[PDB]
Amino acid sequence: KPRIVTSEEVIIRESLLPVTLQCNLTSSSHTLMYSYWTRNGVELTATRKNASNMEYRINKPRAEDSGEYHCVYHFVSAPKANATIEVKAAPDITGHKRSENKNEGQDAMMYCKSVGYPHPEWIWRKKENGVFEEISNSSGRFFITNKENYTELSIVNLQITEDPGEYECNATNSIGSASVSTVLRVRSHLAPLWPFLGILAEIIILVVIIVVYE
Amino acid sequence: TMEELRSLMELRGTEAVVKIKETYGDTEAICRRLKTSPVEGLPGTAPDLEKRKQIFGQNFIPPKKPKTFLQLVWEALQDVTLIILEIAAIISLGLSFYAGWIEGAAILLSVICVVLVTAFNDWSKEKQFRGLQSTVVRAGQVVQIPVAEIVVGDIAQIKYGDLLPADGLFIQGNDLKIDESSLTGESDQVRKSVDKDPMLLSGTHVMEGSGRMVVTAVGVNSQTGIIFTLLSVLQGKLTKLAVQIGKAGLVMSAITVIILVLYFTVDTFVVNKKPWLTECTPVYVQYFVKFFIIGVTVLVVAVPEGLPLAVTISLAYSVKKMMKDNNLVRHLDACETMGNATAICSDKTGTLTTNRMTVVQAYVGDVHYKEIPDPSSINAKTLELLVNAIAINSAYTTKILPPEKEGALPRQVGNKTECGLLGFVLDLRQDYEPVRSQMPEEKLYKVYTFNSVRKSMSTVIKMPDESFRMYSKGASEIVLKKCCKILSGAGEARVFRPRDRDEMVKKVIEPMACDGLRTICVAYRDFPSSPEPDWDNENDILNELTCICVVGIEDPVRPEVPEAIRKCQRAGITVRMVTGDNINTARAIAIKCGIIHPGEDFLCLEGKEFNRRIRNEKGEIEQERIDKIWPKLRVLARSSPTDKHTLVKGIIDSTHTEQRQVVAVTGDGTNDGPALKKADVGFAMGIAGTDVAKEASDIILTDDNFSSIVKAVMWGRNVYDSISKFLQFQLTVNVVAVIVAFTGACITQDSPLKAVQMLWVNLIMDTFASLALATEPPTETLLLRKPYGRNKPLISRTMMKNILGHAVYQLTLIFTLLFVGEKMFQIDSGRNAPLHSPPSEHYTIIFNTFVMMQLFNEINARKIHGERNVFDGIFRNPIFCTIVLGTFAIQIVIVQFGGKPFSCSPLQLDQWMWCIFIGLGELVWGQVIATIPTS
């Protein structure tokens, strides 16, 4: 088994200093063919050389760079050795919908996608009386799905009197936590009736003024 | 060849006589070469026309028509207002590629529409003018032939007022005088004669006399054809208004761009520290591009590109619709000048009367009949003499013809007073044929011509053996006093003395005149003839007459003019009458018309008094003397053709009254040339009008009615009104629009209305308001307002009150929405959106409300005079309804399926209903603002 010595894990802060990740193939009796860096199972571009010792430099480290890095060593007649250098950093929410407007008696969908590593734990909250409480499944109409980035909250058979409000994903991780908010509004069924009663109230007083004038 | 004859007649001098004598002799020596029989004439057969016109080629082809549709498009493209729009579209299209392109197309579309419409209407107008305006007295045959055909050899009969259609050698005639200023530039009356100057020229006007001509050639080789081939106060005010609006719009656009750039730079660089990194240069220029485009679009909104289109559309619509009202317009600017008309100087006969002469009263047998009598009532030995003295007296060509069409009246063809006399004779159950047939020119030798100088026509007949029989018809005052006996009683020849005739004048003549009857007198004489009388001394050869009977002819006043004149006087227009009849008859008819009312102080002075009282210093004409007459003058009797001209000149040029006067003159005749051109607008007569009076006028009346003139006045006022209402609507829109932009750049850092939406608003307002508000049909309410002044401003008080009130309502609603729409609708605020951001439905609501308010205010902008019932007459103009409904549907589709390119997000049903609610509220606010006194 080839021996690979790797650099220590790095926590990406707001500092602009470039970060260098190092692997050294210290012991190998096989004719090495090539080597490459990989991030989250994706081979980084232009990282294939001889590289019996291999380096990767990040000039502007950001939270989007952090991930589970590997330096894979492919040999002529030996199985590959991968190893792992984890680059930890706090998570950041990169995508959400500002508001969700839906008719009563319909479904609602909200999501909070984020970037970081190690991948976070998604929990949702609901703002009541000025403070954020935990979501409650007290009617079986709430569905929460959790993934690495994606989280999804779904509501069925919206109720105008209870559901509307602001919800908040929470994205926690050993480095830190981040959160954003989404406003859900449920529209009444009798909405298109009040303006109609207005329009009539303008016609039957626009006529009255005219015919009296004649 | 015609070329030799043309070169011969080109001399135009006293040498022509010599040449004609030295080479061509008289007319008949070489008339055979032209292939023409003078006395016999030409039947008018096609083979004869082909044989005599083997090398004619063609007639005078109409002008080349260099104005094609493409030429008109190019001409209308270089308009001052459209240059700005097309330049700005070019800048926008160039600046886009760096959906921005969707901006430029909008501007382009506007320009395209305008130019197309303009070109189309212009071309249409030209075709109409060619179609409407293209029997000639030069007939050849004894029967009249149509004007179109013109041949070489035809024998023209020329009368006073004929416009000469071709060139020809003179043959015979009496005292022919012609105005040749159309060719020489000299306005002196050339007297034509075989022995001095026998040529007759196309395009010259016959001022006096009559004759015949043998045309040298049909071929249009006359000097006038050769030279012709060789060849708006409202508009000024509107141009001034357009340039002022453009300047204000330019200033506002520049200020908006400066404010936006200042905000961006100060906020991004000074308040917050950000260095000018080169990598961010594209973003920093995209911002600038956006700001610039916003400014540009504001300018193209503020520029009024629909004003000239509105003017041309209203003028073309009115000109086309006048033709179905018996007015055909030649000069376009006369359509709107008639709106301001403040005086009309018409003539009695032809226009105010039906010009049909009938006999209703008589004074025969020393008895006054008010109705046509039985033939037995009148004693014998007198009826025969009356028939002899009427049938043979004058103008054997005044034949009476049956109508023979839909039971019409027996229209007359000759001198109308003599026609009425023949009608009276026929109504006595007699016939003039057994008298005229037995008396041809055979013994008819001594005839005195009829003219206004003598007002009488006399003939001598040789039939009485060893005697003569003089006949005379006179104006009851020139001729009546010349008689010496009365055929009264049972044929008795009582002695006529100055004593009893004075009482007779006040007994029968005065009541006849007061009934509106023109009084004429018939007299006869018998010369002994044993010594031949020397008949050249008119003073004595017309005396010693014997009056047979006195008859009063009449022509009824048209049934429509008593109300047309009333409408004219209600609309502030004063109408005067100029006539050649005696003062009594003129006053009697002017009372029936309504021109002068029985109780008032209105002058009715004659022509001689008029000339005497306006010339104090020798014969000089003084404006001060005229200014004391024309304000209170209604009837001008026994006038002269120059009297009408001097009255028009005195009225127009006067600076005495508080308001400048614009007059209209109705004319018909030879000498109504200068009087009909000094006036501001001239009306020629349709059927009774000569060619000289038709080529100097501005409008021609097809039906000859005076009541047509009033229609013209109405159709003038409508034109003005149309422009006014358009202006109203347009101004309101752009005011709000501009203000919104200038308040979007200060409170926020972006205009609430994007560039493409503002271009849609500009398209609606300018193009469609010009097309829809400028075709309003006229109503009878227009003829109830005093004529407008000269320096009256376009933006009247009510128009600016409407502009301010509706702008106030629209501005408050738009600002309230822009700042509280996130909470009123619960729709998430769209303010402070970053660059390249998805559209929101907070701003789509503002755009939709703006457009709906504009449409519901376009409905309001159809009333300028404070009228409350806006929907009055809305269905008489289908263009308005079509355009408004089409715009509404297009707005719906733009908001719904018109997303990211138009910056519009789809709306639900209640938001649409709220937008419509606010528009109808604009209608109700229009109702509110109408109940405010502008005084």
Ligand SMILES: Nc1ncnc2c1ncn2[C@@H]1O[C@H](COP(=O)(O)OP(=O)(O)NP(=O)(O)O)[C@@H](O)[C@H]1O
């Ligand atoms: N055939 C006629 N023979 C003799 N006198 C006539 C004849 N016709 C008209 N008169 C009279 O002689 C004058 C001729 O004037 P005329 O040319 O008919 O115009 P007017 O009637 O005077 N004016 P106007 O109605 O405007 O054309 C008038 O005084 C008539 O009364």
Ligand SMILES: *[C@@H]1O[C@H](CO)[C@@H](O)[C@H](O)[C@H]1NC(C)=O
């Ligand atoms: C790099 O080159 C050395 C020297 O030839 C060789 O031993 C080694 O296997 C190579 N590694 C590769 C090609 O990955």
Ligand SMILES: *[C@@H]1O[C@H](CO)[C@@H](O)[C@H](O)[C@H]1NC(C)=O
């Ligand atoms: C790791 O490899 C690099 C690159 O060759 C080398 O400089 C460094 O000394 C190596 N470190 C160790 C501990 O072998």
Ligand SMILES: *[C@@H]1O[C@H](CO)[C@@H](O)[C@H](O)[C@H]1NC(C)=O
């Ligand atoms: C390398 O192989 C190991 C075997 O345990 C595996 O866990 C790891 O994910 C592999 N690395 C990559 C980048 O696939």
Ligand SMILES: *[C@@H]1O[C@H](CO)[C@@H](O)[C@H](O)[C@H]1NC(C)=O
């Ligand atoms: C809520 O209860 C329903 C019905 O038992 C279940 O399907 C759903 O997954 C539950 N959701 C949560 C977040 O507990």
Ligand SMILES: *[C@@H]1O[C@H](CO)[C@@H](O)[C@H](O)[C@H]1NC(C)=O
């Ligand atoms: C989330 O993880 C998936 C793999 O499941 C990856 O394809 C995607 O790029 C990640 N990020 C986002 C923002 O979806």
Ligand SMILES: *[C@@H]1O[C@H](CO)[C@@H](O)[C@H](O)[C@H]1NC(C)=O
């Ligand atoms: C997420 O947890 C962190 C840590 O307390 C906090 O900053 C954030 O507000 C939390 N989220 C919610 C939804 O309360």
Ligand SMILES: [Ca+2]
């Ligand atoms: Ca415009």
Ligand SMILES: [Mg+2]
């Ligand atoms: Mg006359």
